[PDB]
Structure formats: structure tokens, C-alpha cells
């Protein structure tokens, strides 16, 4: 650069007083000259002194641009594709290119199978997407995406890094741009990149694209079906934190569609491992992606509980405290692991052995976080399934807190919340109370709380699910005469009779059972049940 | 964030015993069918989903390696291009 | 019993003597008197000498039927439902019921929660469906089917056996009935039984319904999504041949839809284990079902190939010999296990290590089974990928047999295109497909030098070049591919140039399939190197845009 | 039997190197891309499906066990006049 400094003012001024000529020839339409014109202009664009002169004139830039998207001579389309590349190294050059409509011309050059042409074309569009504003919506109009995605198969990691990023910039904040990429086999092409290349920058830029795509409702399936979950799961162990986090962001985003996915053993194993990692965002994405992957999947449930996942989740709830960003997903994941899988009875016990009762129960006292309360109630119900939890739960005063939630939610209900309906809370509490009322000592507390009148009312509910858990808690409650007397006196004797016709044989059974216990030391009921054709 | 409950998948529904015609077996009937009910896997709580959609924060690509050196640049070729290039040769 | 035979004459006479009062009483306008009469009639129906006398009086049977579907009292419903049950044990009884409108009344009683009622009514209908021709059509019209599926949630295994059989009886052959069963949660409930119950008679009856349902394109997915594959696979190990066989038939009818199903580890394993069986029906079902489940499923592929699945298939092949009902699915399954999954290289090896190479290649000469030849041609291509297979294949003389199919399929294709007719007696297989397949196999095989000379001395070069002009890019590729490997030998390359291939190859360089676009160049390049006094072709592959 | 080929859609196309300019590098270009075309899972043969629909032949299940589980008619005598005709006939003296 020392020589170019010496004759700098000469070179600059010499090139300036040669623009009209260079613009003249370059415009003079007969390739033999034009090609030789873009050749010398290409050489001038290699020096700073003359490069800035070239970008300074709108005429030359417009001339080069036009010549580019016309010529078919590789030499010419390579000679004009390299000047623009050069000029794009300057904000004034980017702006000139942009205004000359260089974007469409450059998009057209994304057809050529030639290294040079392709390399110059992409690095120049990249520079337009990184700096020159208004370029994004300009490239989308030039159908750039459609010509960039078929480029994802070129065997050049450096080239791929740039191309992927271009997609990222174009895809971000644009719902429509995301859909186009899908139509062109974007997900599969990107997910192949993740399985094949080791280049960390390409993996990272690519993971960022996958991140932006995973938010699209229609892209999610496409990425998971192509093996996105597994391909990103392999990169959770990388030595590049920025890569691990981009993959986690994506896995968490896709996790609501992978609940039926295949061979995710290694991924789950390290997701549970990441529940101990100190990095908060990691802990939060891993705890989130786990709550989703264990949704109605006995296999995942079993494998997760089989890798110290229950213990891992409780330790995450303890480190998180008032963070509903971690606690909620973690309580959902625990409720999942404690129900409907071969190892559920096991997880129900480990939560107690690992002192989760204290931490979990306390979560019932969260202010404007209903989703966490609803989730915790459900978790409590599952835990109440295990007979060994009946005491631990009464220790944490769950029965009081539950009936408090119950009464409140019943007032607001009889009257007429982050998507949480109060109707579901009545069911939740009554449902947990129905299970907790299996333990005798718990029946006393429930009966001392004067909850019978309430339960008897719920029998009138239109909600089937409500009537069932209601007639259930009464059922197990009438097991004792003292409580039964109250139930009889409250006028429950009638509604149960009309529940015997419930198409839900479950609640129907509960109804019958109650009636059979409230006439213990007090036949007309038996006739009603037997002597009925329908 | 949108939250959705998922009804239990392929869970074994509780099968109940037909109703007896005699009163003396009505107790046993209730007991038998009570056990099916108390173990209903189709009954709540249902597992839930939490549809995440973190679309990043529009970070900018940090220093990606370029795909493309100070050689000698002399315009000797200009002298052998006939007519309209002698203008550039003068410069 | 002896007591009844002594008084058989008196009991029969007394019953008939009592018919007038019994009937009148049944027709009484007082529901109290009617119900009382249904009991006396019920008590009489519990004896042969009396039944025959009752079922012989159409007026009485009709009075019993009328009562059954007009009454709303339980005690009378038990009695009438009982009477018909007793009469349905006789031809003359079944008929009287059938023609007195018993089926409708019986169906109406299927709504009762009461065991006794439910039991009598259900077996009576069973007898009608079994022995009373006209009942099947008549139960469908009574919409009894919609009221039978909800009964599947009842606890009694014996009751379910009779209930599921009735479903099989109605459903068999009747597309309509199958859809009703599906719309009322049939598959859901049936698959549950196959998962909870061990009672063989019910497992068998239930399996037969599923088998019937598994032929319906609508019922298949529903059964599969209910875990049917898993629930049926569970019973492939039972000591009841009829059960096992029923599950196999059903597992095979479902298989084409379960290509995505998870948790088939167990099922897939016990299928491979049954390829060791002598039974031709078992073999057919297991080989066919394995073939499908390994269709585009690397997991299942890798799992089967991991559990001696490749070996079993080859034995299931050597034992079937010319039975294409077995060999075709077997070779397909084998083509699946030899490509597009982690353990593909292992399978390609265990095939040779099981002396399957000679037997499969023998399948190329199968007289009238193109679907098998096409499948075998594909399998030979995958096996050729493994370099250790080039020798056993060369030894089995695969190349000449392939070329024979090739030259044959090509001339046949050329004939019918010049005649604008369709190649007859080819079960969906197109002679084009066969050309592609043969050229593709040779393409791989030509990776071996010994095999190159074979292909060369057979004068196949002029034909491969004619394939470059094909409108099938899938053929353009392999044609150019095999020539690519052929052109790496000088004396072989000169001939490819003497055929005037330099021209059609220039067209392929601009091919939208970059695969065939590379093979083309590698040819233009290898034919000019040995002929280099070559430069001009490289300028063509570089000086071009778009 | 319905025979259908299924294309391996979950398989990714091979990756080819971009094209040089110097006809000296084309030698390596062709030799490189060639290695990619040889590992192309996108290319046939394709795995196939064999649709089966065997509904059986219509065998009859006839060995399903029954669900089955006093003697005097003397009660007729106390059922009033309505059943007098049947009292003198069956149960009674």
C-alpha cells in the first residue's frame, strides 16, 4: 500500500478524468470493446485511489451494473461481477450499487456454476444485506431466496457461511420470507449442513438461520422431519458456546412438534445434563425443551427419569426460585414424569426422596403466575397418587392452600389469567383433593375446612370433568359417617341420583358410591340403580 | 407464550362391569367399577405444551471469512487495441 | 334330565294346552299382568319339551317380541330377553324371532346397562348372525352395529368374545359396516382388547375383526395410530396358531401405513424370527410385512439388519425358491437393508456371507415375474456398492444376465414405442424402468476392472451412448456414469468416441442433474487424454454462464 | 397387490464443488465432483411398498363358550283370577 500512497492523488485524478471515456466504452454496445472496458475498470477497482473515483460516479456504476445482467461471456460477467464486489467495500459504493439496481443483476448471477462469478456475486449481496438499508425488501423482490437456497449444495464452507447468513438476514422479521425458504427445500438443505460440516462459522451462521426458521408454524415440522432435532442435538456438546445456545434456542422452538420424534436418547441425556450448567439461558432452554419433549411420550418420560432427570429438575427449581421462566417448564416436566409411563411410580417417589415437596408446594403461592399454579396443582395430584406422599404433602399444608384456591376460583366462576381459565382451577384443586382424600388424616382436614357444601354444589356443574372429581372427593369423603351425615344433610342425596345416568361411567360410579355410604346407619337407592332398563 | 393441554395418547380406557340385576351384588359392583374409575388414565391432569418461538435478536454476522494481494498493475495491453483505446492509452 | 324325558310328552302337551292363556295374558293391556306372563313363559322356555311348543306358536313369539321392545320395565325385559335367548338355540326359534321383528327389539335391549339383559340379547343376535340367513343384513338396518361397539368397554371377556364376533360377522365383506365401526371408535376399542386381555377366544375373535378392518384404507391408519402394530405384534408369540396367523395377516395389511410408526423394535424382531418357519403363509406375511416396514425407514432398516434380518431373509429365499409370493417381498426387504442407513455396508456384506448372491442372481432368470426382476436388479446394484461383492457377483455371472435383460428390455421398449402399444404381461413394471435398473447396476459393477472388460467385450458401448439421448434423465445419468467408468481404459475409451458420443455429452453438461453433468465431463475428459496430440473440451466446460 | 415406489425424500442431495476457470484445475474439479455423484442417495433404486388387503375367506367361529349361569309354579295360585286357568293347569291341586 506504500506505492499507491505515493502516486495516490495522481491515480485518483487520472482515473477521474478517464471516467467519461470508460463509461463511454462500457456503454458502447459491442462486447469485444465492452469486455475489454470492464477489464480495465476491473483493474482500476483494485486500487483505492481509483476505486473511490469509480464509486463516486453514478454513471460508471450504472453502466457496469447493466453490462453485468446482460453479457453472457463468463469473462465479462466475471469482470463486471468483481468490480461491484470491490465497490461494495465502501458505503458509498454499496449505495451506488443499490440505486443502480445492482441487486437484481447480482441475483441473476447466482445461476452461474462458476466459483469466481458466484463468490463475487454473493459477497456483494451480503455486503448489501449487512449495511445498505432497503436492500432486504429489495432482494426479496428479486427472488433472491429462490436462487440462494439451491446454492446450499456447493461444497465450499466459506461460501456457505455467507450464503446462510444472507438467508438469515432476509428471513429475520419476515414471515413471508420464511415460507419461501421452506418451498425451496431450505430446512433439509440447512439441516444437511449441520450433519456434514465441521467449519464452526458455517455451523453457527446456519444454526442462526435454523433459529429464525424454527419460529414459523409450518417450518417447525419441516425441520423436525428432516432430522433437525437430532442434527442440532449433536451440536449441543460443541466447544463454541454461541453455537450451543443457537441450537438450544432452536431445539426449544421445535420441541412442541418433536413430541413424537425418533431416537432422541443422546439429546435428552445432554438436555438433562444442561439442567446443571450454570449458564442461565442454557438452563432455561434445556428445562423448556424437556417439558415439551416429555409431553405425552412415555418413552421420553422413562428415559428422562432414567437419567436422574427428576433430581435434575428439582435442583433447577431450587436454583431458580421466583423465576417462572424455569419453574413453570420444570414443574410441567415433573408432572409429565410422574404420570402415564412405566417409571411414573418411580418419579413420584424420587421427587419426595429429593425434597421436592417443600419447593413445589410453595409454588402454589405465586402472584400473577397462574400457569405455574395450574401446573403445580396437576403435579401435586400426580404426587398424591403415591401413598408415601400423602403425609409429606399434608406437611407442606397443601390441603389448606388448595381449598383456598378452590373457594376463590369458585366465586369468580359462579360469578361469570394468562390463558388459564378459573374453571380448570376448580377441577385442578378438586382433582388433587380427590386423590389426597385417599389418606384418612387428609379427609379430616378437608372436612374441617367445611368443603362439603362446596363439593356438593359442584355436582350441579355442567363440566363433566368437574362432576367426576367432585363426586369422587365426596365418594372417598363419605367413607366416614361423620362426614357422610354432613353430605346427606347438605342435600347431596338428590344430585348423585341424577349422576347415575352419566355417560361417563367413571363419575356415574362415584355417584352411586356416595349414595351407598350416606345410607349406612341411616334400600330405595339400590332399587333406583338396579330397576332401570336404561 | 401459548399454552396447550394434550389429551393422553393411546391410554388404556377403564372398562366397567355391566350392572347386576340383584341388590346383593350391587356393593361388589360399585367396588369393582370404583377401581376402574380411580385408575382412569384418560382423566386429567393432561400433559401440556409450551410453544416457544424465540426468533433471536437480529444479531449481525461477526467477521465471516472472505472468499477473496498486491500485484503489479501495468496497462500494456491498451497499446494493442486499435482505434478507440488510444484515448485511454493517452491517459 | 331323565325326569324331563319321562314327562316330555306331558310337558309338551301341557305347554301347547297353555298357549291360548299365555298369549292372551301377554297381550293384556295391564303391564302388571303382561310382565307376570313373561315370567311363566320364561320358565317354560327353560325346557325342551316346552320350548318346542312355544317356538311353534308364532302368535306367542310375536307377543314376546312386541313386549320386548315396548316394555320399559326391567323385570319383564329380563324375561323376554331370556325367552328369545332360549328359542335362538333352535332353527325354528331363530326363524320365528327373525320374522317377528326380533332383531330390532334385541338391538333396543343393547342400550341397557344391565348384565342379564345385555347378555341374553347379545348372544341371541349372535345366533341369528351365525345360523339365521338374512340376519346380517337385518342387523345393519337395525343399526345394531352402532350399539355394539360401545359394548366393547364392558368387562366380561366372554361377553366381548360374542360381541367382537358379531362385529366380524357384520363387518366381513361389508365396506359400509367397517366405516360405521370406525366412526364409533372401533379400532381404538379393539386394539385395546388386544392389549389388555389374554383370553384366547377373545384375542382370536378380536384379531379376526381387525383383520377384516385392515383391508379398509380408512380403518388402517386408525388401527395403526391406536398402536395396532404393537398390540398385534405382542401376539405373534402366542401358542395359538389361529391367533398368530390372524395377527400376521393383519400386520401385513397395515404395514404399508406403518412405515413411520415408532416403537416397533419388538415386533420387527419377532417377525425376523419367524422367517425360520416352514409354514408358507407365515413366511409370506412376515417377509411381506418386513419389506414394507423397511421402506424408507433407516431406523427399522438398521434394526432389522442388526438382528439377523438379512440372514433370515436369504434363508426365507432359499426355501421359497420360485415362490414369488415370498421372494419378491424378501428381495425388496433386502434391497432396503442394503442402502440409505448406517448399517447398509454391514448388510451388503452379510448377504454375500450367507451365500445369497448366487440365489438372488438366479432370480434374474425367473420366467414371468418382472416385479421380482426389477426388485432383484435393484438389489444387485446395492450389493455392487460393496467392493467385496464384485467377485462373487462376477463369479455368479451377473453381468451377462443383466446385459441380457438390458438388451431385451431396450428392444421391447423400442418396439412398443414404434407401435404406440403397451408392453403386455408386465405387472406394472415398465421396460424403461428395467433399462435404467440394468444400466445402473452395471454402472456400479463397472467400478471393478475385471467387470469393465466383461461389459466391454459384450459390445454394450453403442447402446449406452444411445441412452444419452433418452428423455429419462434418470437413464441419462447411469448411461453416462457407466461410460465414465468405462472410459478410464484407453482401448475402451476409443470405442466410446468412435460411436460419436462427444456430441450428446455436450448436452448433458448443461443438465439440471449435476450428477449426470459430472459423469458427462469425466467422459469427454478421459477420451481426449489418451487422444492428446483434449484442450478444446476443457474450454467448453469452463467458458460458460448459467 | 398394489406396487408403489417411494422416493427417499428424507435424503439430502450430494454436494458438488463450484467450477474453476483454469482448464488445469478442471482435472481436479471433475475428479472431485465425481466422488460426490457416486454417493448420491437421491438416485434410484427406490424402496417400494407392497399394499396388502387380505380379508380372509369367511370362516365361522362356532366354539365361543356361553354366558349362561327353581322348579315349582305354585306361585300362580296366589296371582288371582287372571291366572286361575294356568293355576289348575301347572302349579296347584
From Swiss-Prot, chain C:
Chain positions found as Phosphoserine: 57, 538
Principal location: other
Membrane topology: Peripheral membrane protein
UniProt keyword annotations, A-Z: Acetylation, Cardiomyopathy, Cell adhesion, Cell junction, Cell membrane, Cytoplasm, Cytoskeleton, Disease variant, Glycoprotein, Membrane, Nucleus, Palmoplantar keratoderma, Phosphoprotein, Repeat
GO cellular component: adherens junction; catenin complex; cell-cell junction; cornified envelope; cytoplasm; cytoplasmic side of plasma membrane; cytoskeleton; cytosol
ARM repeats (start-end): 7-46, 47-90, 91-130, 133-172, 173-216, 217-256, 258-295, 298-339, 345-385, 387-426, 449-488, 490-534
Protein name in UniProt: Junction plakoglobin
Source organism (scientific name): Homo sapiens (Human)
Swiss-Prot record, chain D:
Region (Required for binding alpha, beta and gamma catenins): 30-93
Taxonomic superkingdom: Eukaryota
Membrane topology (Cytoplasmic): 1-93
Organism per entry: Mus musculus (Mouse)
Record's protein name: E-Cad/CTF3
Record PTM Phosphoserine, positions in chain: 12, 57, 59, 65
Amino acid at each position: 500500500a506504500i506505492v499507491h500512497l505515493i502516486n495516490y492523488q495522481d491515480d485518483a485524478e487520472l482515473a477521474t478524468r478517464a471516467l467519461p471515456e470508460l463509461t463511454k466504452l462500457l456503454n458502447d454496445e459491442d462486447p469485444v470493446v465492452v469486455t475489454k472496458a470492464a477489464m480495465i475498470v476491473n483493474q482500476l477497482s483494485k486500487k483505492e485511489a481509483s476505486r473511490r473515483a469509480l464509486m463516486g460516479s453514478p454513471q460508471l456504476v450504472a453502466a457496469v451494473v447493466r453490462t453485468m445482467q446482460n453479457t453472457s461471456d463468463l469473462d465479462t460477467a466475471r469482470c463486471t461481477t468483481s468490480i461491484l464486489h470491490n465497490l461494495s467495500h465502501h458505503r458509498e459504493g454499496l449505495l451506488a450499487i443499490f440505486k443502480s439496481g445492482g441487486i437484481p443483476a447480482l441475483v441473476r448471477m447466482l445461476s452461474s456454476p462458476v466459483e469466481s462469478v458466484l463468490f463475487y456475486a454473493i459477497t456483494t449481496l451480503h455486503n448489501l444485506l449487512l449495511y445498505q438499508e432497503g436492500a432486504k425488501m429489495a432482494v426479496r423482490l428479486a427472488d433472491g431466496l429462490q436462487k440462494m437456497v439451491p446454492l446450499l449444495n456447493k461444497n465450499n464452507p466459506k461460501f456457505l457461511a455467507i450464503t446462510t447468513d444472507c438467508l438469515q438476514l432476509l428471513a429475520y422479521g419476515n414471515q413471508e420470507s420464511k415460507l419461501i425458504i421452506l418451498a425451496n427445500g431450505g430446512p433439509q438443505a440447512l439441516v444437511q449442513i449441520m450433519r456434514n460440516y465441521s467449519y464452526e462459522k458455517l455451523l453457527w451462521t446456519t444454526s442462526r438461520v435454523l433459529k429464525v426458521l424454527s419460529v414459523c408454524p409450518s417450518n417447525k415440522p419441516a425441520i423436525v422431519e428432516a432430522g433437525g432435532m437430532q442434527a442440532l442435538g449433536k451440536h449441543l456438546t460443541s466447544n463454541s458456546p454461541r453455537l450451543v445456545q443457537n441450537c438450544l434456542w432452536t431445539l426449544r422452538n421445535l420441541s412442541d412438534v418433536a413430541t413424537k420424534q425418533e431416537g432422541l436418547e443422546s439429546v435428552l441425556k445432554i438436555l438433562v445434563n444442561q439442567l446443571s450448567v450454570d449458564d442461565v439461558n442454557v438452563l432455561t432452554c434445556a428445562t423448556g425443551t424437556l417439558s415439551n419433549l416429555t409431553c405425552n411420550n412415555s418413552k421420553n418420560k422413562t428415559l428422562v427419569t432414567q437419567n436422574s432427570g427428576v433430581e435434575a429438575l428439582i435442583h433447577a427449581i431450587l436454583r431458580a426460585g421466583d423465576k417462572d421462566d424455569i419453574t413453570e417448564p420444570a414443574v410441567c416436566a415433573l408432572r409429565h414424569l410422574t404420570s402415564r409411563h412405566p417409571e411414573a411410580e418411580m418419579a413420584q417417589n424420587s421427587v419426595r426422596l429429593n425434597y421436592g415437596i417443600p419447593a413445589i408446594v410453595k409454588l402454589l403461592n405465586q402472584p400473577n403466575q397462574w400457569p405455574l399454579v395450574k401446573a403445580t396443582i396437576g403435579l401435586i395430584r400426580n404426587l398424591a397418587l403415591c401413598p408415601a406422599n400423602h403425609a409429606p404433602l399434608q406437611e407442606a399444608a397443601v390441603i389448606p392452600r388448595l381449598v383456598q384456591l378452590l373457594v376463590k376460583a369458585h366465586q369468580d366462576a359462579q360469578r361469570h389469567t394468562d390463558g388459564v381459565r378459573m374453571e380448570e382451577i376448580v377441577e385442578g384443586c378438586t382433582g388433587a383433593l380427590h386423590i389426597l382424600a385417599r389418606d384418612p388424616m387428609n379427609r379430616m382436614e378437608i372436612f374441617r375446612l367445611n368443603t362439603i357444601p362446596l363439593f356438593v354444589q359442584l355436582l350441579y356443574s355442567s363440566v363433566e370433568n368437574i362432576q367426576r372429581v367432585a363426586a369422587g372427593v365426596l365418594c372417598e369423603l363419605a367413607q366416614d359417617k361423620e362426614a357422610a351425615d354432613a353430605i346427606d344433610a347438605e342435600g347431596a342425596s338428590a344430585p348423585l341420583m341424577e349422576l347415575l345416568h352419566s355417560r361417563n361411567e367413571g363419575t356415574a360410579t362415584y355417584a352411586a358410591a356416595v349414595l351407598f355410604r350416606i345410607s349406612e346407619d341411616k334400600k330405595r337407592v339400590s332399587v333406583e340403580l338396579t330397576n332401570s332398563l336404561f | 407464550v401459548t399454552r396447550n393441554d394434550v389429551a393422553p395418547t393411546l391410554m388404556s380406557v377403564p372398562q366397567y362391569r355391566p350392572r347386576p340385576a340383584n341388590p346383593d351384588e350391587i356393593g361388589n359392583f360399585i367396588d369393582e367399577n370404583l377401581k376402574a374409575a380411580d385408575s382412569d388414565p384418560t382423566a386429567p391432569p393432561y400433559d401440556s405444551l409450551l410453544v416457544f418461538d424465540y426468533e433471536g435478536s437480529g444479531s449481525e454476522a461477526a467477521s465471516l471469512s472472505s472468499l477473496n494481494s498486491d500485484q503489479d498493475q501495468d496497462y500494456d495491453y491498451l497499446n494493442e487495441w486499435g482505434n478507440r483505446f488510444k484515448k485511454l492509452a493517452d491517459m
